[PDB]
Amino acid sequence: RDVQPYAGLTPCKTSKAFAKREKTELKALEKRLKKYDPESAPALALQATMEKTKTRFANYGESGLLCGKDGLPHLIVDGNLEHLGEFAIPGLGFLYVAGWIGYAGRSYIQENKTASKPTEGEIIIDVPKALGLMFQAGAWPLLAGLELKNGTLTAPESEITVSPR
C-alpha cells in the first residue's frame, strides 16, 4: 500500500535510503558468498539468506512503513488509521493475551484458595482444573466486565490489610 508522508517521514517503499539499506546488506551477503563455491552447503545457505533479506525488504516496502533519514522504518503509534498495524492491532492482541494470562491466574488462585491446603496446590498445580480455568479465560474481557459491574472484581477497603500509618 501507498502511505502518505507523516511527521517528516517518507514511505520506505519509495525511500532511496531504504533501497540503499537493501543494497548494502545484499552486497555484504554476496561478499560473504564469494569465498564459497556454489556447490557447497554454505553457498546455498547464504543464497537463501540473501533471498530472505530481499523478501523482508520487499515486505517492509509494501507494508506501508515510513522510513527516516537514516533509512530504517519508523513506527507511528499516535493512532493514525494508515499505521494502525504498527501499534494498535498488535497492541490489542497483547492486551487480549496478557489479560487472558492474568485472568487464568486470578481464576486459579481464587479456586485454589477454596482447597483444604491452598499453599500446596500453589506449587503442585492441579493440571486438569488449571487447564479448565485457562481455557475458560478465553473470554477474559467479558468475565472481567461482569466482575467489574457486579463489584466482585475489587475487594472492599475494609477487608484488605493496611499499615497502621
Partner: protein, 41 residues
C-alpha cells in the same frame, strides 16, 4: 507412576514444559511467518 505425574505437576517441571512448548510455538511462528516488524494490512 501417579506420584510421578504429581511430581511433573510441580511448579518447576510445569514451568519448564510450558516455556519449552511456548518457545517452540514462537520459534515455529517466526520460521513460517518470519521477520514481522508490524501486523500487515
Amino acid at each position: 507412576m501417579k506420584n510421578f505425574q504429581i511430581y511433573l505437576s510441580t511448579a518447576p517441571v510445569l514451568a519448564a514444559v510450558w516455556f519449552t512448548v511456548l518457545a517452540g510455538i514462537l520459534i515455529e511462528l517466526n520460521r513460517f511467518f518470519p521477520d514481522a516488524l508490524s501486523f500487515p494490512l
